[PDB]
Amino acid sequence: QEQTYVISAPKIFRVGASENIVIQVYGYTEAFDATISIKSYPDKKFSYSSGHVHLSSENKFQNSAILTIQPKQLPGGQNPVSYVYLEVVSKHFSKSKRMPITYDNGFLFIHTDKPVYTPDQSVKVRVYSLNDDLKPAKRETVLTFIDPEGSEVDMVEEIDHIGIISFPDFKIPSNPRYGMWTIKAKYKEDFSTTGTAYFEVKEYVLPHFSVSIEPEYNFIGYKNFKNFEITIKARYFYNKVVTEADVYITFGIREDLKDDQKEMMQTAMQNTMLINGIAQVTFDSETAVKELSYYSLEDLNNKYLYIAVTVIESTGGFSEEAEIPGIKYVLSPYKLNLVATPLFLKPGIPYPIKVQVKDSLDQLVGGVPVTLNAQTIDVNQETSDLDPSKSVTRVDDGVASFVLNLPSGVTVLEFNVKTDAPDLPEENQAREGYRAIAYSSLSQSYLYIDWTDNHKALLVGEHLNIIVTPKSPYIDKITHYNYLILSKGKIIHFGTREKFSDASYQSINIPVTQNMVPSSRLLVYYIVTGEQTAELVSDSVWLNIEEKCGNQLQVHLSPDADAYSPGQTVSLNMATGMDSWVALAAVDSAVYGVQRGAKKPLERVFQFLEKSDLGCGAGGGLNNANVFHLAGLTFLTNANADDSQENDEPCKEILYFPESWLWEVHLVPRRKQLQFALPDSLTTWEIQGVGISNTGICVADTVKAKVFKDVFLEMNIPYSVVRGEQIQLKGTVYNYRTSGMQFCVKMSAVEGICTSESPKCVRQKVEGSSSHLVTFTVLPLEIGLHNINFSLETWFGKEILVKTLRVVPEGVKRESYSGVTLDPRGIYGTISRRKEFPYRIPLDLVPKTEIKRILSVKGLLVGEILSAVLSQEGINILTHLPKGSAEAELMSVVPVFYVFHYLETGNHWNIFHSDPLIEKQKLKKKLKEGMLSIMSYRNADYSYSVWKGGSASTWLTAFALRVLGQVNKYVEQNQNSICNSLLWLVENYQLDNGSFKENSQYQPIKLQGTLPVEARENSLYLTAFTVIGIRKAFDICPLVKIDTALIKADNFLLENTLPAQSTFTLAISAYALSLGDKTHPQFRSIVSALKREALVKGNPPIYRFWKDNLQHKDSSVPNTGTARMVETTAYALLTSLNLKDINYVNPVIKWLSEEQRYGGGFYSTQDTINAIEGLTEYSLLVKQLRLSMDIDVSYKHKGALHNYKMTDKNFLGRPVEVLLNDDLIVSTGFGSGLATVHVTTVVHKT
Amino acid sequence: DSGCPQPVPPENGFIRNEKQLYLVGEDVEISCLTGFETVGYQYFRCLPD
Ligand SMILES: *[C@@H]1O[C@H](CO)[C@@H](O[C@@H]2O[C@H](CO)[C@@H](O)[C@H](O)[C@H]2NC(C)=O)[C@H](O)[C@H]1NC(C)=O
């Protein structure tokens, strides 16, 4: 085993990616070629990609193939391809391995211009769209908005030309649901990546000042429980402290961070004054809780202190509410976890251990003292112990670092790490322990990466310098070792490192490249083939690389100041290392103030790129195969290793007053200047540039342009005012000059408002660096948006707040709903092609509101079309067994009608791919010759008989009638004979309770009849059979007494059947009634029984069928028992179909299509015909359910309003505003499939 | 998944589109037995809860 190979590949191929596959071979000395290929699995038939690589001494027998599985070459369709063959071929070896493939190429980042929207806003959204190589994907993206109901709302697809997809603005539907909307982005075509973002649709006003609640730390224990200092700070978004304000604190005992009875602590509700923008507070849990509640101690409350804070400006109309959702009362506050700690030993290398300490509601606690103690197990369990080292966690990292000098004898280390929490016992200072295992080399042929715990991030363009030592018995033979550098899934670099003469080996000196910047993984491996046996020896380490952007886009404004002034014309300069697209967004910092901790949209985007790393942990591994697997690789080798044993759980180790503007995308050819006027908001504009170029995404530095005016009015106009309510529009005049001023504030308003003061006015004065409370009382007369000009006539001219008051009508806004399921083919009965929604003005409408109406439609997709067919071996039925005597003729021809019907009901006469039964003309000839042969069996008085002169059989007559009714849809036949035979069967053989009682045929012809149950319900069987026949034929001769007879027989079935003795009878009678009143309560009871006689396999049923009397133990060959079982199953199936219950049907079609489950073939006629029938029907149903329904919606007195082109590609009806007073019509053609249209009426009732 | 179980229909109603589990936002359509007729909003919206 000297001649050996390793081919190293990403653990998973990404479709459309380029997978760099590297091959090394050992002990060859003649040059040879190998080809590496990706081939379809399992057939190896299609070569998706192939690479020819030359292995030779100047290659050093090392090379790689760039293989790409182009997405359109995979077959696609209903099944994705889960696997593919990686194959290598050479003069010396061939091997192929089943590789998994993933349809998950690239990244979708959804950038939403604000986290929060009022209604009536449009949410501007764009998606940054990157290939697996972090290049512009140029793939069109489907972008789906989910209302917190979870209902699909809208879908929009936009071509990606740029790597930036500027979607149309999504206008919030005219009655949204408040709360967390979801946006899902998916690539339209092959790749099935997803992006997701959230935005909150909420009634809000931008808070004026950022009230900040900053507890010393997020937990309360014995130290704090008596005394817990908590700091309030409030700053305006123009970042000057709220110089004075009234602070209101209120406290609650919250059992969980849930909607709760907060149990507010009136004992502790407190006031303080916000001295220069700060107020230190403390809560004493003792006096608060014992004075108010039973709880004596946090032993009783492993719970949360809720705190809410109201800051009122005290000299102004603004007030802001801040909260902490809860501070954890805890006996044991902390928990340990490891970070970047492999849990794998390198005997003789200092073993670094890093524990982070997290508190409850975890944050890094920073300064907790930690001690680590461990037991060292040497070979043969020779156990020993280490002294307990101590370290304090790093204050700004939470990490207590440890290093254990381990003897080279250690086989496993198990070590415990405990919080030396000074204020706790160990019984509350939680403690943890871990196993660390050596590499488990078989030969003891080890390789170690001498990585000096350099967790400090490496800098792009610096040379790496990693020492590696292959300590091996056979270093005489280990000429060289190989290395691979991994970044995301890709092997970005590979190479070889000679043994120097001294038996030192070359360092890995390669420079760290820009393709490494999120992270990299170094794997190092060699095969040594000492004695006659090869060992693959390998190691890997996690490499932490700086998040250096490739384009390094930076954005700054050209002027600079403490603050710009409202409307100041300003230049924005974008400067970049290369040509770049850049997307700009300015938002008011206030908008994040709407929330607590609202994360900037593209936070930590490198930490999302990191998620394409296929490895996990800081490196190392239990074994060579484990080292490769944890590195996110797999390999082909003959060196006595494979990683197919290495399957594992998913690995979780850790290592004008706009609100937004400048929403623009520009080509910045290395430099560009924008000019614009800063809007009138006196706020910090956080301006975010995001660069996109051939080197990926670079979210830049968030410029924070302070907009500031020395002296101004700001008005606390609420979001909305109730129409016709006297309300104080409170506000504040601010003077930040050092001199005081005398000011007059006045309100100028449109006539839709009437106002009190009507001032030149009182001309009040305000001190320097101070603000005066201003207020106006107003009454809004009429609904809508009304311009109010607040203005401040004062030294240095004027100020004028052009504002809009928003007025909503009185009472309560009520919403109530109507819809219809449009079933234009009768998929459920009555043809619901059209519906009309009258403009029903309610009796209690508030005097002048408008009734809002909103319409939407949902397509009801058919789902899983489980597809099953007769073989072309149905030529067996076309060319059936001899047309002999003893009704053998009938058995011959009857199935031909069914098979003709089946072929009619489908593509079979649109197309045969093979073995065609296409000569439908000859088939129709044989069909009508059949109908002749059966009509031969008709006796004189329109009975049928088994023989030309035999005893008239009602069973046979109903059977014939069934056949003839079924076929009359395809061959016209003299209905008078059908009328006569029907009225014969009714008048001669109807009797009450026991309808259609059979005239003695002297024998059951078991080849044609079933063998019923004989003792009882034989009559229920026969009534069911005859009712089926009549229901199949009465439609072509609807003589009234035949309907009366159907009433009689259906009533008798409904009454007699429910206590069914036999599943067979239950089934058949269920069917018969399904032909009749599908919706009679008795019918539904019988159905509900049948559905419980059903037998299944699988937790969700994969197969479902019915059996009775154990006629199933003998299923090895088709026989009367299996015949009966198939019969009763096909009746059940038919029934279900008539219920149109596809979800039920499907596993019954799956059972019926597996011949083996009922002994192979069919036995007798009945089973066979009923099975063919059922497959026919099921085909039919699936067609009828196929959604293709252009739905007209039109007003009654006016033009069309919308046209929903509903299709299974586009099943979702965007909500359409239906605000006009017309009666509203919705209609569709014959169309196809099933939809449901909903109109919601929203109205205010007194 | 916490998709809603099959609801109890109104008396004399039945579930048109019976399913063992309904995805969030599925309409389940109530319909009335032969003697009876749906007056109102026959559809229940399976909420994420
Ligand atoms: C509020 O003040 C603005 C001006 O700052 C008024 O808008 C002006 O209205 C006049 C008359 O319609 C126009 O000639 C000007 O062109 C408008 N200017 C602008 C910038 O729009 C507005 O009408 C005032 N509204 C109230 C209620 O007083």
Comparing alpha-carbon positions, the chain B residue that sits nearest to A1240 is B41
Whether A352 and A341 have beta carbons less than 8 Å apart is answered as yes
Cβ of A149 within 8 Å of Cβ of B45? The answer is: yes
Separation CA A399–CA A622 (nearest Å):
25
Structure-block tokens of residue A1001: 């045929």
**What is the H or E stretch that residue A630 is in?**
helix A624-630
Question: Counting Cβ atoms within 10 Å, is residue A645 exposed (0-12), middle (13-18) or buried (19+)?
Answer: exposed
CA of A802, closest atom in ligand 1: 1
Decide whether any atom of ligand 1 lies within 6 Å of the A791 Cβ: no
Measure in Å the smallest separation between the Cα of A829 and chain B Cα atoms: 11
**CB nearest A149 (choices: B40, B43, B47):** B47
CA of A748, closest atom in ligand 1: 28
CA distances from A1174 to A902, A942, A1164 (A): 10, 29, 16
Separation CA A142–CA A715 (nearest Å):
42
Number of H helices, E strands in chain B: 0, 5
Give distance in angstroms: CA of A124 to centre of ligand 1.
29
Cβ of B41 within 8 Å of Cβ of A152? The answer is: no
Among A1027, A937, A947, which Cα is nearest to A982's?
A1027
Residue of the CA atom closest to atom 1 of ligand 1: A789
DSSP annotation string for A1078-1107: TT-HHHHHHHHHHHHH-EEETTTTSEEE--
Among A955, A959, A938, A960, which Cα is nearest to A947's?
A938
Give distance in angstroms: CA of A763 to centre of ligand 1.
24
Cβ of B29 within 8 Å of Cβ of A1236? The answer is: yes
**CB nearest B34 (choices: A152, A1077, A1236):** A1077
**What is the H or E stretch that residue A52 is in?**
strand A47-55
Separation CA A1146–CA A1131 (nearest Å):
14
Q: How was this structure determined?
A: cryo-EM
Cβ of B29 within 8 Å of Cβ of A817? The answer is: no
Main-chain phi, psi angles of A737, to 5 degrees: -75, 155
User: For residue A888, how far is the Cα from the chain centroid?
Assistant: 59
CA distances from A501 to A459, A498, A504 (A): 32, 9, 7
Among A131, A182, A140, which Cα is nearest to A165's?
A140
Whether A538 and A524 have beta carbons less than 8 Å apart is answered as yes
**Peptide bond just before A42 cis, omega within 30 deg:** yes
Measure in Å the smallest separation between the Cα of B11 and chain A Cα atoms: 11
Cβ of A1079 within 8 Å of Cβ of B18? The answer is: no
Cβ of B33 within 8 Å of Cβ of A148? The answer is: no
Q: Which residues of A814-825 are buried (b: 16+ CB within 10 A; e: fewer)?
A: eeeebbbbbbbb
Q: Would you list which residues of chain A are within 8 Å, Cβ to Cβ, of chain B?
A: 148-152, 816-819, 821, 828, 858, 860, 1077, 1079-1081, 1084, 1100, 1141, 1143-1144, 1236, 1238
Decide whether any atom of ligand 1 lies within 6 Å of the A802 Cβ: yes
Structure-block tokens of residue A968: 């009359």
CB-CB neighbours of A784 under 10 Å:
13
The residue to mutate among A787, A803, A804, having the most atoms of ligand 1 within 8 angstroms of its beta carbon, is A787
Give distance in angstroms: CA of A760 to centre of ligand 1.
21
* Length of chain B (residues): 49
Comparing alpha-carbon positions, the chain B residue that sits nearest to A1077 is B34
Resolution of the determined structure in angstroms stands at 3.0
Structure-block tokens of residue A173: 């539907």
Give distance in angstroms: CA of A775 to centre of ligand 1.
23
Separation CA B13–CA B19 (nearest Å):
16
The residue to mutate among A717, A791, A802, having the most atoms of ligand 1 within 8 angstroms of its beta carbon, is A802
Whether A67 and A50 have beta carbons less than 8 Å apart is answered as yes
Measure in Å the smallest separation between the Cα of A1081 and chain B Cα atoms: 7
DSSP annotation string for A128-164: EEE-TTSSB----EEEEEE-TT--EEEEEEE--SSSE
CB-CB neighbours of B43 under 10 Å:
20
CB-CB neighbours of A1183 under 10 Å:
15
Q: Which residues of A909-938 are buried (b: 16+ CB within 10 A; e: fewer)?
A: beeeeeeebeeeeebeebbeebbeebeebb
DSSP annotation string for A270-292: EEEE-GGGEEEEEE-HIIIIITT
Separation CA A959–CA A1026 (nearest Å):
8
How is the beta sheet containing A765-766 ordered, strand by strand? A721-722, A800-808, A784-794, A741-749, A765-766
Among A1144, A977, A1011, A1122, which Cα is nearest to A1074's?
A1144
Give distance in angstroms: CA of A168 to centre of ligand 1.
31
Measure in Å the smallest separation between the Cα of A1051 and chain B Cα atoms: 14
Separation CA A7–CA A63 (nearest Å):
10
Give distance in angstroms: CA of A120 to centre of ligand 1.
24
Q: Would you list which residues of chain B are within 8 Å, Cβ to Cβ, of chain A?
A: 14, 16-20, 24-25, 27, 29, 31, 33-34, 40-43, 45, 47-48
Among A569, A853, A624, which Cα is nearest to A6's?
A624
Among A411, A472, A466, which Cα is nearest to A446's?
A472
Instruction: Name every chain B residue with its beta carbon within 8 A of the beta carbon of A1240.
Output: none
Instruction: Name every chain A residue with its beta carbon within 8 A of the beta carbon of B14.
Output: 1079, 1084
CB-CB neighbours of A226 under 10 Å:
12
Decide whether any atom of ligand 1 lies within 6 Å of the A789 Cβ: yes
Pairing of strands A344-345, A170-171: unpaired
Cβ of A150 within 8 Å of Cβ of B41? The answer is: no
Helix (H, G, I), strand (E, B) or coil at A1239: strand
DSSP summary character for residue A6? E
Instruction: Name every chain A residue with its beta carbon within 8 A of the beta carbon of B34.
Output: 1077, 1079-1081
Among A535, A724, A736, which Cα is nearest to A640's?
A535
Among A605, A768, A1012, which Cα is nearest to A243's?
A768
Decide whether any atom of ligand 1 lies within 6 Å of the A800 Cβ: yes
Q: Which amino acid is at A582?
A: V
* E runs forming strands in A62-115: 62-68, 83-90, 94-102, 107-112
Residue of the CA atom closest to atom 18 of ligand 1: A802
Cβ of A152 within 8 Å of Cβ of B14? The answer is: no
CA angle A1101, A1103, A1106 (to 5 degrees): 105
Q: Which amino acid is at A200?
A: E
CB contacts < 8 Å between A and B, how many?
49
**CB nearest B25 (choices: A149, A1084, A1143):** A149
Main-chain phi, psi angles of A1084, to 5 degrees: -60, -35
H helical segments located in A850-974: 875-878, 888-904, 920-936, 954-968
Whether A40 and A86 have beta carbons less than 8 Å apart is answered as no
Decide whether any atom of ligand 1 lies within 6 Å of the A787 Cβ: yes
A1156: left (phi over 0), alpha (psi -120 to 50) or beta: alpha
A942: left (phi over 0), alpha (psi -120 to 50) or beta: left
Among A311, A304, A293, A303, which Cα is nearest to A249's?
A311
